């Protein structure tokens, strides 16, 4: 459901756009030795090019 998807998309610490720092926080905490230049997923996720991932782009990545 939409509620479930927003919850999945609302599992961070802001609630505003997924920022690089937010993705980094998640990837760092789940164990991920990822370079600052290892955005990859999030980087490619950026459809409109604003350097972040909004709800619609998150949905499309999933």
């Amino acid at each position: 459901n939409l509620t479930v998807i927003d919850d999945l998309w609302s599992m961070l610490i802001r609630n505003c756009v997924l920022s690089v720092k937010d993705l980094q926080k998640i990837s760092n905490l789940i164990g991920a030795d990822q370079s600052s230049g290892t955005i990859e997923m999030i980087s490619c996720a950026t459809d409109g090019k604003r350097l972040f991932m909004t709800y619609l782009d998150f949905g499309c990545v999933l």
Binding site: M11, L23, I26, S27, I30, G31, A32, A45, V61
Partner: protein, 524 residues
């Protein structure tokens, strides 16, 4: 610039011994590297020797009569007569090779004889112009008959191959001696060259199909042909000569780009003396050398290899026990009674396999045992450290002291059993020792339905997932003051949780999101 061109012309008048361990390791590495390079040189030179352009020229050096002698008719009644004719051909080939070469050059600097560590150290100090030798140069030199003894013998092998005889190039590889731990490694200048060239680095082997043996041929230096049984005229003898010619890697290259370690033929004491001076003296160097050979051995095994291996096996059988105590230190097959470790026993029913007359004491004799007859024992704890427990009603074979003393019992491998740890529960719960850890010193010690995940954060991960695990004590760190410490290098979890854990330690978008989804369905 101006002093570089215009030379200053003036009249300036003027009236223990063991290196560090770092040098030890540097010498071992440099020894390996150098050996490999030499063996590759022998391979490539053997290629050059196979050159067709050369063989069509050298073929014309061998009269028909001699070709027939090199390929005698098979003699049924008495194959030896054929061997005879073969040897006569090889001799005549050797004679006409002297006619062919004429000019022999001296080695510019020790040729490929062994160099000292000091020499290698100072070689980097001063650069030198080197006239390059390309394949074409080699061919031209061999055809004109001009060059040092190595190029000479190489040409000879090429001639024999031109005449379709199965002739090997033999190279006694002389890397620097990694056993020589001296700092100052100076050599006696008296008759240095003559002693260096007393025995050759390259020679030839020819297969005799009638007697089924390799015949040794040195047509340049010793100018002889021999059928080596136990003794070879080509192994260097005398302390002087063995300072630049230490026989330990005699390598054979054949028509078909084969590469075989043939030292056994030329070394009387392969197993006792030479082994000490070879990189193969320990398991790692053994595997390393086998890897190099294989890398240079570009053909399938033949029946000849089988024959030569039988020859080597007989040479091994008949080398026997060495004449001296030193040569039995770390011998691959034998041990002196007095060298049996406190933690070893003679296998039941076995005894000595020979004796040693001790040089220096009248009638003094030492008992020599085959190593195959010595069994290694360990205590119960030591076996647990190898993932083994004792069988029911096992009796110990030896009792030995320790420190504050203590009587430790020792058991044989046959008295021990493979330890099987209890399985994890359905939920994946591991059963752990008194400290709350699982001891995992051997793969055997992992539960059948579990896996070991080794990672600095595998614990933080398993705790974070709230899943069932057990910290893994994989070894013991020995540290300052007086106290041992367990090394908790990771986690034992059930198998079905491996990837969950790996995600936890490891963490695309979907993976990161799903782990978030799990973390939340788990916390609350």
């Amino acid at each position: 610039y101006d002093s570089e061109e215009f030379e200053d012309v003036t009249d300036g008048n003027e009236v223990r011994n063991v290196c560090s361990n770092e040098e030890r390791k540097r010498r071992k590495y440099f020894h390996m590297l150098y050996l490999v390079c030499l063996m590759v040189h022998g391979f490539i030179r053997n290629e050059w020797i196979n050159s067709k352009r050369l063989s069509r020229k050298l073929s014309n050096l061998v009269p028909e009569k001699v070709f027939e002698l090199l390929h005698p008719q098979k003699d049924e009644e008495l194959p030896l007569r054929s061997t005879r004719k073969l040897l006569d051909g090889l001799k005549k080939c050797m004679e006409l090779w002297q006619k062919h070469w004429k000019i022999t050059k001296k080695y510019d600097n020790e040729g490929l004889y062994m160099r000292t560590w000091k020499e290698i150290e100072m070689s980097a100090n001063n650069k030198r112009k080197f006239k390059t030798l390309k394949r074409s140069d080699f061919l031209r030199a061999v055809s004109k008959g001009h060059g040092d003894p190595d190029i000479s013998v190489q040409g000879f092998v090429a001639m024999l191959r031109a005449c379709n005889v199965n002739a090997r190039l033999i190279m006694s590889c002389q890397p620097p001696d990694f056993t020589n731990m001296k700092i100052d490694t100076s050599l006696n200048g008296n008759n240095a060259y003559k002693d260096m060239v007393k025995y050759p680095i390259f020679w030839c082997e020819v297969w005799d199909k009638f007697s089924k043996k390799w015949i040794t041929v040195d047509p340049v230096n010793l100018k002889t042909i021999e059928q080596v049984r136990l003794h070879s005229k080509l192994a260097p003898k005398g302390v002087a000569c063995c300072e630049r010619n230490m026989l330990r890697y005699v390598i054979a290259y054949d028509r078909k780009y084969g590469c075989r370690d043939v030292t056994r033929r030329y070394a009387q004491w392969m197993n006792s003396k030479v082994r000490k001076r070879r990189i193969t003296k320990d398991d790692f160097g053994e595997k390393w050398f086998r890897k190099v050979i294989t890398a240079l051995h570009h053909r399938k095994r033949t029946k000849i290899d089988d024959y030569e291996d039988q020859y080597f096996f007989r040479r091994d059988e008949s080398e026997g026990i060495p004449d001296s105590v030193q040569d039995l230190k770390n011998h691959p097959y034998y041990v002196l009674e007095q060298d049996i470790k406190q933690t070893q026993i003679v296998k039941p029913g076995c005894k000595e396999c020979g004796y040693l007359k001790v040089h220096g004491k009248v009638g003094k004799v030492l008992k020599v045992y085959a190593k195959r007859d010595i069994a290694d024992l360990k205590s119960a704890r030591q076996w647990y450290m190898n993932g083994r427990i004792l069988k029911t009603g096992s009796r110990c074979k030896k009792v030995i002291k320790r420190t504050v003393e203590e009587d430790e019992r020792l058991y044989s491998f046959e008295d021990t059993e493979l330890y099987i740890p209890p399985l994890a529960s359905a939920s994946g719960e591991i059963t752990k020792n008194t400290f709350g850890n699982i001891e995992v010193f051997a793969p055997t010690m992992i539960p059948g339905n579990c896996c070991l995940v080794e990672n600095p954060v595998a614990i933080k991960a398993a705790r974070f997932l709230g899943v069932e695990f057990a910290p893994a004590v994989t070894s013991f760190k020995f540290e300052r003051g007086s106290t041992v410490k367990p090394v908790l290098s990771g986690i034992v979890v059930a198998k079905w949780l491996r990837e969950a854990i790996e995600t936890a330690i490891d963490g695309s978008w979907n993976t990161l999101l799903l782990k978030l989804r799990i973390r939340s369905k788990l916390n609350s």
